[PDB]
Amino acid sequence: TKQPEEVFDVLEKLGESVYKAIHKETGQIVAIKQVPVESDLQEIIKEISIMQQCDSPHVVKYYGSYFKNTDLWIVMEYCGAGSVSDIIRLRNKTLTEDEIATILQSTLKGLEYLHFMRKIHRDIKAGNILLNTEGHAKLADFGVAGQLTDTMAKRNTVIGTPFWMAPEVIQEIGYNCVADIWSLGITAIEMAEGKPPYADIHPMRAIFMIPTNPPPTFRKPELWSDNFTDFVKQCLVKSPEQRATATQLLQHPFVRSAKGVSILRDLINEAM
Ligand SMILES: COCCNC(=O)Nc1cc(F)c(Oc2ccnc3[nH]cc(-c4ccn(C(C)C)n4)c23)c(F)c1
């Protein structure tokens, strides 16, 4: 119930509108997203309602909102390294298997938690996985997330970002939490190659082919271990009923043996 600029000292812009700020009472660094109150709020409202219901170390926290002048200030957990796709672009380097194993282990714990709560993220991609400066990965951008309920055991909205969308999401048939596991497999290729399969095709053409085409594979299979190859194959099983869960993939040899967040220390330092 206090004015936002007496609670927060706003520092630099982080994105275009998102700012770094200090919570003046604890010295904790936060991210503040500022949107005009007169803008289209549909996805911000959806996003904030999903984040408010989540309490996981693997999901970006929401701390609250304020009116300031004619803007809405949305206060969130600060992830100082930015997104995985920011880190790939900034270093001009794809991630090693070990870096990918460590990031995807934390991503999978975030998926396991969301899936237990009957949430589907629906936009899993390197752009939507943020790292804090200590190297802990967090799921962000709940703008298109779905909620299963007792009476609605499936969603059927064709939604997501085309290159990352599961075949059953593109097709008319309903789907459930394991749509995110397909998106995770595409994200694994994205982190290893810098872009998803079909990145150079028109998105609306790519969406037409994903349901009919075989599961994608690495562009240069000889670069990658049997474990990494098998991990991607399990993620990209076309049958949703047969596809591995987040819990099961946490035991996959590629993930189960991942190094701690220290292997991301070089990576984060170079990026920042
Ligand atoms: C030219 O290409 C682009 C350049 N890169 C670039 O803009 N990266 C970048 C990456 C970010 F993650 C980013 O946002 C954050 C940064 C730190 N900590 C955060 N905590 C929460 C967020 C965040 C930002 C936006 N959201 C909404 C989905 C509600 N949430 C956040 C941002 F503002 C910018």
Numbering used by the authors: 23 to 38, 43 to 298
Question: What is the paper's account of this structure, in its own sentences?
Answer:
Mitogen-activated protein kinase kinase kinase kinase 1 (MAP4K1) is a serine/threonine kinase that acts as an immune checkpoint downstream of T-cell receptor stimulation. MAP4K1 activity is enhanced by prostaglandin E2 (PGE2) and transforming growth factor beta (TGFβ), immune modulators commonly present in the tumor microenvironment. Therefore, its pharmacological inhibition is an attractive immuno-oncology concept for inducing therapeutic T-cell responses in cancer patients. Through its proline-rich domain, MAP4K1 binds to a diversity of adaptors in hematopoietic cells, including those involved in T-cell receptor (TCR), B-cell receptor, and cytokine-induced signaling. The function of MAP4K1 has been studied most extensively in the context of T-cell activation.
Protein X-ray crystallography confirmed that the urea moiety interacts in a bidentate hydrogen bond with the Asp101 side chain in MAP4K1 (Asp112 in the surrogate kinase MST1). Ureas synthesized from cyclic amines, which reduced overall H-bond donors by one (not shown), also displayed more than a 10-fold decrease in activity, highlighting the importance of the two hydrogen bonds for overall potency.
